[PDB]
Amino acid sequence: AAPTATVTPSSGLSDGTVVKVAGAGLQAGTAYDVGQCAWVDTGVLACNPADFSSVTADANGSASTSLTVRRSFEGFLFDGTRWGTVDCTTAACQVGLSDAAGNGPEGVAISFN
Numbered sequence: 001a002a003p004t005a006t007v008t009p010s011s012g013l014s015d016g017t018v019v020k021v022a023g024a025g026l027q028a029g030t031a032y033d034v035g036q037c038a039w040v041d042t043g044v045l046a047c048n049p050a051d052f053s054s055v056t057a058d059a060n061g062s063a064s065t066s067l068t069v070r071r072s073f074e075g076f077l078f079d080g081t082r083w084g085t086v087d088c089t090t091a092a093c094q095v096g097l098s099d100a101a102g103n104g105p106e107g108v109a110i111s112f113n
Helices: none
Strands: 004-008 018-024 031-041 044-047 053-056 063-068 072-076 082-087 093-098
Touching (some): 044 072
Antiparallel strands (some): 031 044
8 A cells, every 4th residue: 555644633732742643554664754844835845853753664564653743943944944933823734754765655734723
């Protein structure tokens, strides 16, 4: 099956809340980074590297880890440029997993309202 991710809880969040991130259909035995990002332009994500986590998929291609989410954060682009402050109540924030090459399941939308 194609890779998928789930984030629990995904709504009613507060700054500093810890969520469970699970992935399935991942590459067995591979390291994945887990993080919170927001789409700031067509095909451009601004992320919060200060709270990224990582996990290694098991022999069945499954993984489960915890992530501390932030209501707002200083966003950074892939090239390391500081983008500015991202507010998840007025920007579409998501949590996702990706391998060393940036591949993985689609991200999951979260809400802090």
